[PDB]
Amino acid sequence: MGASKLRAVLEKLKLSRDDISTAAGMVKGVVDHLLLRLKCDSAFRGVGLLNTGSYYEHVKISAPNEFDVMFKLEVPRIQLEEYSNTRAYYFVKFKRNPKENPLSQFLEGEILSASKMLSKFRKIIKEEINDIKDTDVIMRKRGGSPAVTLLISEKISVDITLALESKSSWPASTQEGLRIQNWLSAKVRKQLRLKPFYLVPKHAKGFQEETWRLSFSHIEKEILNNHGKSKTCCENKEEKCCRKDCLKLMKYLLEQLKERFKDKKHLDKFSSYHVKTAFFHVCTQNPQDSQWDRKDLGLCFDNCVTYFLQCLRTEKLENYFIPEFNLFSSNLIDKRSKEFLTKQIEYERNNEFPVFD
Ligand SMILES: [Zn+2]
Numbered sequence: 001m002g003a004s005k006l007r008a009v010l011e012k013l014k015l016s017r018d019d020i021s022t023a024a025g026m027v028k029g030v031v032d033h034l035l036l037r038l039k040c041d042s043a044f045r046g047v048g049l050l051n052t053g054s055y056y057e058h059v060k061i062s063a064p065n066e067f068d069v070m071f072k073l074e075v076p077r078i079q080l081e082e083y084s085n086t087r088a089y090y091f092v093k094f095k096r097n098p099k100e101n102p103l104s105q106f107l108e109g110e111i112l113s114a115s116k117m118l119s120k121f122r123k124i125i126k127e128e129i130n131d132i133k134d135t136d137v138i139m140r141k142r143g144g145s146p147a148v149t150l151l152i153s154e155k156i157s158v159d160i161t162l163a164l165e166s167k168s169s170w171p172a173s174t175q176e177g178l179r180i181q182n183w184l185s186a187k188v189r190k191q192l193r194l195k196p197f198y199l200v201p202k203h204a205k206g207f208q209e210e211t212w213r214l215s216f217s218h219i220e221k222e223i224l225n226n227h228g229k230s231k232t233c234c235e236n237k238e239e240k241c242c243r244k245d246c247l248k249l250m251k252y253l254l255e256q257l258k259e260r261f262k263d264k265k266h267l268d269k270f271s272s273y274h275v276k277t278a279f280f281h282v283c284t285q286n287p288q289d290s291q292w293d294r295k296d297l298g299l300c301f302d303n304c305v306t307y308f309l310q311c312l313r314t315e316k317l318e319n320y321f322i323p324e325f326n327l328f329s330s331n332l333i334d335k336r337s338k339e340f341l342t343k344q345i346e347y348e349r350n351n352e353f354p355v356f357d
Contacts, residue, residue: 192222
């Protein structure tokens with residue numbers, strides 16, 4: 001009866017998924033143009049999409065016209081140098097000479113200037129969009145990633161993020177992360193940690209302008225699309241779990257609250273990544289597929305709220321790959337804000353989530 005409201009929500013959220021094809025078509029066309037234009041440039045010759053065939057992703061479950069795209073570009077024989085003790089932010093250096101290095105034009109002494117590479121990236125896409133019909137660049141103010149935001153027609157918006165790709169083994173700060181062993185298995189954790197990692201240009205703590213931040217959204221996607229202890233989770237009537245549903249609700253709950261109190265400015269610092277990160281932690285605490293039965297959707301969603309609430313109240317939310325990086329440290333989000341969102345979430349669940357209606 002109470003899980004009934006939740007399924008109602010999900011059905012209406014699912015509604016904005018049939019006509020993706022008409023908008024996703026316009027996104028694919030614009031990013032193919034931009035890729036080909038950037039490949040025509042020496043510094044960006046190896047540029048490419050993250051998952052070809054998965055052009056876009058939807059960060060905002062409630063804004064289906066807002067698309068997220070990642071352009072990756074391989075940097076062979078990269079040498080990272082961790083910035084301060086932040087565990088997630090790195091200066092980028094090169095094992096090889098600038099003659100062997102196409103990013104050579106972007107060096108600032110020994111390090112890869114994120115601001116120089118971003119400037120050129122933006123200029124090319126900017127100059128190129130001027131020769132694409134119904135598209136404009138609204139572009140920034142987010143540390144570097146995303147680099148640009150495009151406005152296709154006057155309706156669809158695409159965030160384009162540059163990312164360096166490295167095929168070397170993941171940095172030491174990730175040694176004790178990705179604690180999937182009891183859930184998806186040690187075999188799988190070992191397979192995933194053989195994949196590339198990415199660095200996206202992001203400022204760090206005034207600010208340090210040339211840092212890069214580790215990014216694992218390709219691993220996040222891989223886990224969500226292959227998410228169960230049973231290899232056949234969600235492949236038949238008898239093994240339908242509510243993991244993905246719960247993450248949607250978590251996401252929708254935060255976006256609605258952010259909308260509900262946009263005039264107040266306490267929830268501006270929270271994002272979908274925070275509830276995705278907490279969601280993965282809950283999967284780790286609850287690794288059996290029987291702890292996510294669809295008939296238990298109400299109870300499962302409640303556990304995600306209760307975990308997240310404890311994260312706010314204790315001010316701990318470890319990045320799921322870099323356990324010593326705390327998304328909720330007082331240096332990143334202040335206590336007043338966490339207490340405000342605590343109060344609202346606590347209100348919402350005590351009244352069967354009126355923000356859902
Ligand atoms: Zn499943």
